[PDB]
Design a protein around this ligand. Structure first.
Ligand code: LI
Ligand code: LI
Lengths: 83, 83
C-alpha cells in the first residue's frame, strides 16, 4: 500500500523509458523544464488542484532522467540527505 | 530498508519545513529552479556524480513545495499515474 521509491522508479521505467530513450537526454530535460514551468503557473494561480498535478509531473520527469542516467534515486537521496 | 515516499516526505518536513516556511513559497520555488539549473549543468558536463547529486536535490526541493502546500506526493503521483 505504501509506495516505495524503488517501485516508483521501476514502474515509471516500464511505462516511459522506451519513449524517453528515443527522444534523448536533452529533450527529456526540456520536458522536465516544461513541467517546472507548469508548476510555476500553478503556484502563481494558487490553484491547489494544479499544484498537485504539476508536483506529480515534476517528480515523474525527474525520475525519467534518473532512469535514463542509470541512477537509483533512493540511494541518491540517502547519499545526500539524512534519511 | 526500502524508503517509502511517505517517509521521504515526512522526514524532509521535519528537517526543512521551518526554514522553507520562513522564506515563503516563491523563494522556495526559486531554490528549486536553482537546483534544476544545477541538474542542467550536470547533464551538460556528463558528470554522473554531479547528476546523482542534483537529481536528489531536485526531488528534495520538489518535496519542499509539496510540504509547503499541504499535498501528499504519493497520492498526487497515484492520481496522475498508473502506480
Ligand atoms: Li503537468
Ligand atoms: Li544541488
Amino acid at each position: 500500500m505504501d509506495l516505495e521509491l524503488k517501485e516508483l522508479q521501476s514502474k515509471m521505467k516500464e511505462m516511459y523509458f522506451e519513449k524517453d530513450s528515443q527522444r534523448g537526454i536533452y529533450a527529456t530535460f526540456t520536458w522536465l523544464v516544461e513541467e517546472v514551468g507548469e508548476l510555476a503557473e500553478a503556484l502563481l494561480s494558487n490553484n491547489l488542484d494544479s499544484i498537485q498535478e504539476e508536483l506529480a509531473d515534476v517528480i515523474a520527469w525527474t525520475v525519467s532522467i534518473a532512469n535514463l542516467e542509470g541512477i537509483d534515486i533512493e540511494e541518491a537521496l540517502k547519499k545526500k540527505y539524512k534519511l
